[PDB]
Amino acid sequence: STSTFQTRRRRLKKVEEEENAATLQLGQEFQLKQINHQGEEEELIALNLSEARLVIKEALVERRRAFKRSQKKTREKELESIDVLLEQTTGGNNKDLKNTMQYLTNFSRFRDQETVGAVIQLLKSTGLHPFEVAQLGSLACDTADEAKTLIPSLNNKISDDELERILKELSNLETLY
Amino acid sequence: VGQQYSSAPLRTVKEVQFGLFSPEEVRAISVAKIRFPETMDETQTRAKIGGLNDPRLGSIDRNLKCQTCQEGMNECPGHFGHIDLAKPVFHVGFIAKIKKVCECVCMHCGKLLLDEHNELMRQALAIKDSKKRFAAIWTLCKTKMVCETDVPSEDDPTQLVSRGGCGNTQPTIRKDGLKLVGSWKKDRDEPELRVLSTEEILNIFKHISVKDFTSLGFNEVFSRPEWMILTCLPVPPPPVRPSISFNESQRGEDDLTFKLADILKANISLETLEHNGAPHHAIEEAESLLQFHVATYMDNDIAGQPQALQKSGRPVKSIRARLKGKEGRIRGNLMGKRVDFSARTVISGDPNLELDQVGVPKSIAKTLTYPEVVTPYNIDRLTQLVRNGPNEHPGAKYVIRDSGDRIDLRYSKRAGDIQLQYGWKVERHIMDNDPVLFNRQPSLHKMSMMAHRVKVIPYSTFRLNLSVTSPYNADFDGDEMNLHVPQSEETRAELSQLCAVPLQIVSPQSNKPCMGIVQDTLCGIRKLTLRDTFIELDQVLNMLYWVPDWDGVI
Amino acid sequence: IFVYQNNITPSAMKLVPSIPPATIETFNEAALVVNITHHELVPKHIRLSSDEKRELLKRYRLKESQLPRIQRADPVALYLGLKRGEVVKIIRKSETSGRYASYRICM
Amino acid sequence: AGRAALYKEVYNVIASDGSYVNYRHMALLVDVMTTQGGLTSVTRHGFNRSNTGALMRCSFEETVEILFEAGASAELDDCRGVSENVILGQMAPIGTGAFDVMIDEESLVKYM
Amino acid sequence: MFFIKDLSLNITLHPSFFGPRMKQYLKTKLLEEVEGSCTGKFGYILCVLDYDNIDIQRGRILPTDGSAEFNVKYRAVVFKPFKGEVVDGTVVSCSQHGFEVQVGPMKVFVTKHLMPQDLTFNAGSNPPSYQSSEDVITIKSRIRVKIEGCISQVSSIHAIGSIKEDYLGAI
Amino acid sequence: RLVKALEDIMVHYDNTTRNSLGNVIQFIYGEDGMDAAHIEKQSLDTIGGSDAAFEKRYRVDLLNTDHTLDPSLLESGSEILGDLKLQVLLDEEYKQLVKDRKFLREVFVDGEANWPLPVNIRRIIQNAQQTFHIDHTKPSDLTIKDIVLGVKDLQENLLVLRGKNEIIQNAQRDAVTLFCCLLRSRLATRRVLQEYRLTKQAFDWVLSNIEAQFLRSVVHPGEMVGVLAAQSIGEPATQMTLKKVTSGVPRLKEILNVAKNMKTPSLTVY
Amino acid sequence: LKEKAIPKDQRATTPYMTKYERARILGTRALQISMNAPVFVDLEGETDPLRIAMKELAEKKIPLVIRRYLPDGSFEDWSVEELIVDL
Amino acid sequence: LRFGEMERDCMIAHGAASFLKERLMEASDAFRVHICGICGLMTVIAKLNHNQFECKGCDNKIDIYQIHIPYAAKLLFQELMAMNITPRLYTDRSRDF
DNA sequence: TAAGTACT
RNA sequence: UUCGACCAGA
DNA sequence: AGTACTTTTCGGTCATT
Ligand SMILES: [Mg+2]
Ligand SMILES: [Zn+2]
Ligand SMILES: [Zn+2]
Ligand SMILES: [Zn+2]
Structure with missing residues (x-):
């Protein structure tokens, strides 16, 4: 299959598979405390759309490059620009990635690696948990209610005013179209 | 091995975790209710009833079905079934402990009989060795027969401290057949003998403490004392107790398949008593019968005589019996097996082979085969062997292609045809210089088995060189010997690089060479030496020609 | 160290391990008439500092259990009086290489 | 000193016959018999009781008797024993198998 | 997410x-x-x-x-x-039992009776839709769903979501 | 039995003898780490022999007309006589050969000086001999410093164990001691020049070979010595076809059983 | 696991290739060669895998790595290249 | 013919590791079974087609291994199980050492 | 055959 | 197949 | 403590189930 950096000693009685809810209780495979290859610890990695769009593109790109060192031996405008990056460094039969790029590129909220950076620098002062610090980034929210309700894991973790300021600076950073 | 690809990753066994089946597990695992004791005949109609063997379990009659698991016969190992007993029964082999455990704990409350409070016990609780704590613990409390409620702590013998309660005197216990009985001493006089019902024992155990298990040689997850008593009985699938058909309209059932049949019967009969005219204790006359069968099925060579003879007086192969040393599974199936690619005949000496050779008779060379992989290096040679056929000597008798399918060279309408494919295998005949393992039993030497060079020769005998005689310890008064044929490019290596006779010449068992010169060659090597003995030209010339490595310098 | 003559009463001996740290040992006369360590066969043993031991282990990557053992009541174990855990280094002659170094832990 | 005797005596049994065995062998055995603590006998009584796995002892003199008390005390077998593997159909860690082999991708390039 | x-x-x-x-x-x-x-x-x-x-x-x-x-x-x-994760995606298929939204590589389906009431279902529409007082849901229409529960399967994952809470529906 | 009792024993890569538990059974296979196959009965010359004859052979005194190497043997014969800085090495040597003597006599009390030892030295020289057509006539060309200082440099390379520390490297010395005694026995100045007229060439060769040869006689971590040792004993047990002691087969049986009541009990008091 | 991996330095095992090692390397390599694996030496006309192996093994052109395990579990890694081949 | 106990001990002596296996597996028994990565048993209901794997009870479908062991050994195990004893087959050591 | 434990 | 006997052998 | 019991100890034939 594809094991995951943490040999959990299963001693016969596998029964306690908790629920998966926005009680910030994600499968054991997504605790806030997971392990890095080097063997070190590291916070979970939560990607809000458009921030993901950038990580993928960024690797799918730098792939086409090292895919040629060896070779020798605007919204609607990016759809076409990405389709190619696939039909060059993708399996082509990865119908998921195709569909993940449309979506990921259609509902995205940022175009500059400089804009997504500030978004992060911003939300990363909240002390909030990765999963929230994601939704907040990928979901439009005008009120503290639209937020503290579509992300019920927040509720008591931040004053509505405060969370309302954040929401302000987001629509202010939200790149146009 | 097994054939048919499986998307399941493949690993090697690293640990073997020994445990005891928990009734609850046994149930979960099973795929068969197993209520009927009969075999098949849905009223003579041939098939199999959802009763015993295949109420969803494995199969027979060469028919896929193994719970859709298909694959059929070869590939579908068995699928345990179960059979909910009537009343708890002992485990013929555990009786020993089950008993030695009670003697370690008192009923009613079910708890140890010596806490950290008794010092002699302390020492027995530091010893880290399941086999040893439990061997010392037992020796300590097998004597005390009063579940003390108040004992003198680490201070004054005057002051008495408390712990668990219920002084209910502890009965000593003895073993009569398959039941445990004990006497309770009453003071004022005279004993009180009563049979310890399994139902009862089982219970006292169920209540033994979590730390109490462990303290006594056990394991909370894999082996709780309470499991030594059978509540649910796993039902081995056909492949453990296969049949034997003489075509059709006959039988062929296996010993085991009968003891289950009995166990089953004896179980039901019980059941229909506790829900009918139950003359209370005219039942425990038929509950002993179950304890019996479910006992004898596993072990049938006990002390309490009754061999459980099967109509005709034949003993009955208990499961135990199948593993018992030599001639059986462990020692005679696993530690040692019958194998393929092997031959044996009569050995005779031949003063014309080099030491490291072994004359193999064409007969065999044409029978024994070595799987070679079609390679550009050989394509040619290989295709020729194939063509040649399986009757001519240097030839082959089986070509196998990537598509995991065997081409039988002696029948196949294409024998003459066929162009090999790099990657195919062409089981060919053993050929001059195919390293083989030769051997003469009893093998009690590294040397009793050495690698030789195959030299295909006429006539029917393994012809070995003389000097390699004393190592195998063989004569030719009709002595036979075994030959084994390697199979992987790397297997050969292991023979040729470590077992080759030239290598065995000097032995560590006595830091001196282990083969020399005998009979003629020796007796004659002396005569040929003597000052007195001279040789003239004509002959000294022939003698020279004979040493193959003569520098041609008379 | 207490040297008895013909024997000690089973009522007395059960008073030795009642005052730690200190320790006591019981030796019979008839057993001390000759020193066993002087015997042709018995090679010389040696105690090891809990420093020298924690070493032996580290240098061989041994766990306490994989070490050869000597009996808590072994004649020489008494002569030197080891303690459950102490390691003795046994050095003897050898018909293969002059001297051979061996180690015996205690149980 | 006991080892010293146990050996001496065993040596003699093989000398009386006018045969010869290199120290090391008789030694090893005489040693296996001793280390543990005292005089461990070469019999189902002794050695086949040691901490060795189950499956291993399982194959000599007590089999089932042994297996039974194995799962009843939930033992765990290392599978380091020659036997252990032979019973599993795996390559025992023995000579040819006392180590592993790998394709060093690095060195697999300098070669060309 | x-x-x-x-x-x-x-x-x-x-x-x-x-x-x-x-x-x-x-x-x-x-x-x-x-x-x-x-x-x-x-x-x-x-x-x-x-x-x-x-x-x-x-x-x-x-x-x-x-x-x-x-x-x-x-x-x-x-x-x-x-479950309980809120995501918005484009609708794909829409029947008389609900519409199916496609949140990325996955397809989340919403039940007719897991939506509101003032939102009925219009059959004789081309393409098929769900009408409201001021809203209209069909193909390309973007929705924001709340994934009620997940169901893994083979080489994909499906899940049922609702649009009956607040700040849930069209955009 | 013997077998089943030692299956699991083999020499591990640390050059230790263990079983499936990792229980050291021998710290160095056979108390020397040598593979039985590479061994022959040699004679430790330093052992037997009258205290008198021992001198006449290994003793060299550069400060004596009658106890020095006659210049007919060494090239720098006459220019040595008297030198005091050499007579120190030359004396160091002797004090050692002597330390040796006593050592052996403490190990092999019987006086028996023939023992199985890796590296057949006798022959290794025998070849050195007729390989360089060495003439028992003309004088050598070895420095007394040449000899003594190279024989010392040899021992440093006869490595059985390797470890980078004291406890280990201390074992090394141990599992080599006996061999070296045999070594110095045969590579003593006097001997090296008077008995087997070696030249520098010869000697530097005889050395190189002993090293390599030795290094080959070690034991290969991998050997399943247990089963070997078992068989090596149990094999000649079958061949046993048969002063009033208990005897062979029945006795061996008596031994492996560790029986309390042995037929013959005896006990020899000197 | 890397605490169980010993550095190329501090290394302690035998500098020379054990008889079983080479025994196996040759076999192993032979096997692979017979499988149509790449050969790193010009076949001087050879055509037998174990024969080609023996050759690869002499020009020490064998891309294999012998990992030597120790009683406690930690191992050492050597290369056919490194290992001396006396025998 | 028969590669009995002694014939084994011999190869063991020889250090002829792989050869020993080849005799024991490939040229005899050799069988392929499926295990539960949870409860070391033969339970696994492998449909080796629709790749379904399951193992209700320890209830799996995900963590499943496949192994090669002498059929006789499979049997040994099944036999032991029939005797209510559980021999767990684990593909990874967790007791270190 | 003959010995060794466990068992009566 | 299984048990058992015999054998026959080296 | 004495007596009985158990284990362990590489081909074809016949007869009965
Ligand atoms: Mg004969
Ligand atoms: Zn099936
Ligand atoms: Zn109580
Ligand atoms: Zn399972």
């Missing part, structure tokens, strides 16, 4: 490919058996990051066939919806 988890996989290479650019082939295969895969414990594997510093370590030769087995350690972008 989308993640970047650290994973590993074992590939069994046939001696055949014990070439010069083996590394190359390995990686290549890594990707054949991952990008596009699916699990319940990882969900949708979408893209292997840092194609270049992929750790192969020394692979060990098996022992009956020269095939070698390397533990290719890597890192990639994953995505496994959860």
